Structure 1
Amino acid sequence: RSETAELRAELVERVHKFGPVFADGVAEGERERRLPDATVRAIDQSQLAMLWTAKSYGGLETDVRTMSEVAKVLSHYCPSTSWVVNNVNGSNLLASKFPRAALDEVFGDAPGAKLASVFAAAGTAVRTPGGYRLTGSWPYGTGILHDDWAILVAREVDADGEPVGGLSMLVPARDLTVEDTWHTVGMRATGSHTVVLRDTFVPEHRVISGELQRSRESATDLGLPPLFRTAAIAAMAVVCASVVLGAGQAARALVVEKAPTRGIAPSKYTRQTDSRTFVSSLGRTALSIDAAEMHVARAATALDDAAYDAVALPDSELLRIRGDVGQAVSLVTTALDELLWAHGAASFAESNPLQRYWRDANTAARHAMLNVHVGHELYGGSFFGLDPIVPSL
């Protein structure tokens, strides 16, 4: 275990090393709505997309905590990069549910392979000899422009067209065609465009049931390494929350950094630190962000402990983790509003990084897996053993 703490220290140190490159390409990504080439280069050199890739394929093969800690530091430099990087690892982790044939095809000669994934069942597939024929239109395809493969969920149907089952299908970039639909006010460089397919062929070995994609049966398998025992869907939500969290932490640091050089208009306080109302308010806001940090870590640690222990997390724990992530990001978005008040009107200038953290965090926070209202109802429901209101845990 002392190894995994040491590795984290190195990967966090890499983010600081490569950070300047990510920070350098912020303006272009905002402008173009995709990651600059220098950034993608840096992501590939740094191996930050390989944290949840297996060691057998030359990956780093870390744990949930390490990915989270890396995510939070990355968001300081560029929230979009942090979001793409984390979604790639999460997508790479989900690919471990596919057969060895698929995994070998994807990672065999590509240690730094990068996957996209959209779980919304936006397509229909039919049985054809040797595999499936897939058609659909999948929005919110994060980082699809730079990814090698994509995991797409679809609804299987028969010759007549009646639904028979859910599928999770791994298709390469060569078969992909991407529509430009990502025009947003935050997380712009994420390039979460729509993936389109039209009668695209997918072989048997690169298709699993959606029922098997959600599986946590690997939790008790001693043959697998700890990482692949982890509850992947929960783990993905945790690291996504870390991206949002990290942006909020950067917003706090900035407001602290600039407070002694600014006043509170139109008050007598020429310095923001001179106002004890400002200081206590900032102390309060900081403690909310600290709570969100403790929330994300609690969940990350629960997933890591169970993975190493090779025990299956009960539904109640998974339901609680979904509440933790929703609560954490909800605290951050409220904290950001409080930080804009603390800073003042200059925060909304395009030259100011504060509005950038504000916009990126707020946009990313409304990801399905981070829904605070759904999270509350899930966690609240676990106390009475009610039916989960979401299909996947």
Structure 2
Amino acid sequence: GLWFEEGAEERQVLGPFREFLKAEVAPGAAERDRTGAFPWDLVRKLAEFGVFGALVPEAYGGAGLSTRLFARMVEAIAYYDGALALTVASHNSLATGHILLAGSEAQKEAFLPKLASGEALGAWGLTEPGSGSDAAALKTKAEKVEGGWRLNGTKQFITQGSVAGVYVVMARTDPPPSPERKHQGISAFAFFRPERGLKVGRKEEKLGLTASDTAQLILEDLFVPEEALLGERGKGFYDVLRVLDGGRIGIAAMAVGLGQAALDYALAYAKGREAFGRPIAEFEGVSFKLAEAATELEAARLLYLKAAELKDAGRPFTLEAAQAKLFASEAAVKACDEAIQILGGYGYVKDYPVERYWRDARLTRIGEGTSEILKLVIARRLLEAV
């Protein structure tokens, strides 16, 4: 069909997928938000579908899907369970994506098959206690030893950090030429869950996405073989930025899914709830919110589809991925907040899903580049183009 809508082939995949989500994922979303229990059962079931190898080429045991279709799949998952959407998006975009992007043929044959089947979930460790937005300020170090490297440092807020079977960690291998250029000298390392040298820190409770595994990683004299070095030594940061460009498309889709769920719930609610003798949807104070949210969410969807298209075409998309994530996350969180408002007192109670949608969506304005950082990324590119 038309570029902006789901084509026949996309519907053939997404239609059945959405029914699976409604039947198997939706029922326990509220409970998972309360308990935080990692959904191993659903991971297993999704993995059997190839969801955890979505972007991985079929040659490596993956589904070989396009960025566009995978993004739509993430939106679909997020509509029913934000935590699961983050689990799926991060696994595919970050750890797996980085190995697919910079891995040698040997590394891709060793890691990709296990990641694509779900046998091994992937964790991507960039952020640290002292550095997030300024990611190049990381302090984890990698020193050269006989047979490989010795890693020492701490990673903060790592998704799948405690359940991962494969880890990709960024560490400094060489001194930076200057503080302005501290990105130089950083390398990436890919390795299977260590027998020793890696421990999970005190788990933090989160505002939302309860069931998503987020943990602190403490690396103490962790040994990794020579084959662990991912990409060229000291040039890992450029690769990190390319990985985040792709990851941002997934987060944009995640945001749209959560915002759409909130809008859909508010629309249905406003049509059935009456006040002053008529459905509240008849008051502009409610209908205008619905119209604005619907419009912004459609705009956000078009933006992430555009970014995905550029990536699928092998063209630069840094600016476009940033714009998509920025707009989708900001619009989605606003839509969720308006949905809470439309339900009134009921929007403040956990028996209804809207308060969870907001709590889950709220992280999309922070993860993989805060909205502030993205505005810098966007402005810089705009100014360069004069």
Cα distance between partner residues in 2 of 1:238 and 1:210: 26
- Segments of 5+ residues of structure 1 without an aligned counterpart are 217-229, 388-393
- 1:282 counterpart (290, 305, 308): 290
Q: 1:201 to 1:19 in 2, by over 3 A?
A: farther
- 1:93 counterpart (81, 92, 97): 97
TM-score by length of 1: 0.83
Report SS of the residue matched to 2:350: coil
| AA aligned opposite 1:348 | Y
CA RMSD between the two structures:
2.8
Residue 363 of structure 1 pairs with residue 363 of structure 2:
yes
Q: Is the 2:200–2:218 contact (alpha carbons within 8 Å) kept by the matching residues of 1?
A: yes
| AA aligned opposite 1:16 | E
What is aligned with 1:187?
209
Aligned residues: 357
Deviation at 1:114, TM superposition (A): 2.6
Q: Is the 1:285–1:339 contact (alpha carbons within 8 Å) kept by the matching residues of 2?
A: no
Instruction: After TM superposition, list the pairs within 5 Å mapping 1:72-221 onto structure 2.
Output: 72-90=75-93, 91-96=95-100, 97-108=102-113, 111-112=116-117, 113-120=120-127, 121-156=138-173, 165-175=185-195, 176-208=198-230, 209=233, 211-212=235-236, 214-215=238-239
Report SS of the residue matched to 1:351: coil
| AA aligned opposite 2:51 | L
Q: Deviations over 1:91-127 (max 9, x none)?
A: 2121121222222222356641431112223511111
Cα distance between partner residues in 1 of 2:351 and 2:318: 41
Cα distance between partner residues in 2 of 1:47 and 1:88: 12
Instruction: After TM superposition, list the pairs within 5 Å mapping 1:279-318 onto structure 2.
Output: 279-305=287-313, 307=314, 312-313=315-316, 317-318=317-318
Cα distance between partner residues in 2 of 1:157 and 1:240: 32
Q: 1:149 to 1:5 in 2, by over 3 A?
A: farther
| AA aligned opposite 2:272 | T
Residue 379 of structure 1 pairs with residue 378 of structure 2:
yes
Q: 1:146 to 1:132 in 2, by over 3 A?
A: same
- 2:254 counterpart (233, 243, 246): 243
Q: 1:83 to 1:359 in 2, by over 3 A?
A: same
Q: 1:320 to 1:71 in 2, by over 3 A?
A: closer
Cα distance between partner residues in 2 of 1:135 and 1:324: 36
Larger displacement relative to structure 2 (200-209 or 317-326): 317-326
Q: Deviations over 1:181-226 (max 9, x none)?
A: 231121111111112221011111111335246349xxxxxxxxxx
Structure 1 residue ranges, 4+ long, deviating more than 6 angstroms after superposition: none
Q: Deviations over 1:237-274 (max 9, x none)?
A: 1111211110000001111112122135xxx2542123
| AA aligned opposite 1:384 | L
Cα distance between partner residues in 2 of 1:189 and 1:27: 10
Cα distance between partner residues in 2 of 1:18 and 1:89: 19
Q: Is the 1:80–1:188 contact (alpha carbons within 8 Å) kept by the matching residues of 2?
A: yes
Q: 1:231 to 1:153 in 2, by over 3 A?
A: closer
Report SS of the residue matched to 1:259: helix
- 1:65 counterpart (49, 64, 68): 68
Deviation at 1:142, TM superposition (A): 0.8
Q: Is the 1:116–1:144 contact (alpha carbons within 8 Å) kept by the matching residues of 2?
A: yes
| AA aligned opposite 1:117 | W
Larger displacement relative to structure 2 (287-296 or 70-79): 287-296
TM-score by length of 2: 0.84
Q: 1:61 to 1:167 in 2, by over 3 A?
A: same
Report SS of the residue matched to 1:182: coil
Q: Is the 2:142–2:151 contact (alpha carbons within 8 Å) kept by the matching residues of 1?
A: yes
What is aligned with 2:133?
none
What is aligned with 1:221?
none
Deviation at 1:300, TM superposition (A): 1.4
Identity of aligned residues (%): 19
Q: 1:195 to 1:271 in 2, by over 3 A?
A: same
Report SS of the residue matched to 2:106: helix
Q: Is the 2:246–2:321 contact (alpha carbons within 8 Å) kept by the matching residues of 1?
A: no
Deviation at 1:131, TM superposition (A): 1.0
Q: Deviations over 1:46-74 (max 9, x none)?
A: 22111012211221111211111001110
Cα distance between partner residues in 2 of 1:32 and 1:293: 31
